[PDB]
């Protein structure tokens, strides 16, 4: 297949063999391919929200199969485990679960595939691509956190937490 995801776009195991003396093979599912992506054709338009959801699930599957490699090459494996990154991106998708336009979902899937390829090929910096993998309500697993707000504002409402903090600087 003449595609970046084609079965023949695999890095050879050796310099004279693909896999072994009796069989071929390679890994482009969990790591990057041998050849760069010249073109990324459009997702075939989905006439059904069913097909849009299937595209979303398959994109998430491709992302999850590729997150250990992304963590390893970007040196962010201590900020979150592979499963924590998967859960954070699942939360990101859950915040977008209300989509109902198959065309818009196809466009979002194309953008997500492009971003995944960018993070896969070191195009984007780790400090910038981690915002999708960053946890929502918990701190990063590579640095100490402060629970001063949790202790001082013990069981107080979110309104009071915002009220005591403020939304603008107090000097101007």
């Amino acid at each position: 297949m003449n595609h970046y995801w084609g079965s023949s776009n695999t890095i050879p195991a050796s310099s004279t063999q693909n896999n072994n003396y009796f069989s071929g093979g390679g890994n482009n599912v969990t790591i990057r391919g041998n050849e760069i992506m010249e073109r990324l054709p459009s997702q075939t338009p989905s006439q059904n929200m069913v097909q849009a959801s299937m595209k979303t699930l398959r994109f998430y599957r491709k992302f999850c199969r590729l997150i250990p490699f992304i963590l390893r090459i970007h040196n962010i494996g201590t900020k979150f485990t592979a499963q924590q990154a998967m859960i954070n991106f699942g939360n990101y998708i859950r915040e977008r679960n209300h989509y109902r336009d198959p065309g818009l979902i196809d466009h979002r899937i194309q953008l997500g595939y492009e971003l995944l390829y960018e993070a896969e090929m070191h195009f984007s910096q780790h400090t910038i691509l981690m915002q999708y993998l960053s946890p929502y309500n918990t701190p990063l697993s590579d640095r100490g956190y402060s629970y001063l707000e949790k202790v001082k504002y013990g069981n107080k409402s979110k309104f009071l937490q915002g009220f005591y903090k403020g939304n603008k600087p107090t000097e101007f």
């Binding site: 004279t16 003396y21 069989s23």
Partner: protein, 116 residues
């Protein structure tokens, strides 16, 4: 400590032993073949100097030519390993087990052997 005749004969045969001793990687065997030819070159020079024979000194360039031809053929054969899906480490081109290799493990290209 050894006389030069003894040393050169001994180390020519030592090179021939080491060529067999080392793992059968084609590039390594090619390097050892060049070393063997150079040992023959030096031994021929030594015997020519000892016996005042210009014919033994003649084999100096002849050995160089034969070694160069064999090295070119070896380069071409090593290139040929790429197109035949053959590992340069020839021990990995067969399924026979050997304890000399830490990691040798070949399995059939199948997922499941038994379907329910």
């Amino acid at each position: 400590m050894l006389t030069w005749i003894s040393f050169w004969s001994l180390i020519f045969w030592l090179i021939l032993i080491i060529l067999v001793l080392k793992p059968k990687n084609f590039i390594s065997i090619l390097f050892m073949s060049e070393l063997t030819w150079l040992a023959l070159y030096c031994l021929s020079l030594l015997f020519g100097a000892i016996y005042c024979d210009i014919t033994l000194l003649s084999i100096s360039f002849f050995i160089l030519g034969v070694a160069g031809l064999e090295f070119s053929f070896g380069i071409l054969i090593a290139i040929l390993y790429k197109n035949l899906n053959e590992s340069l480490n020839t021990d990995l081109n067969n399924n026979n087990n050997n304890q000399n290799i830490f990691d040798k493990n070949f399995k059939t290209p199948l997922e499941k052997i038994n379907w329910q």
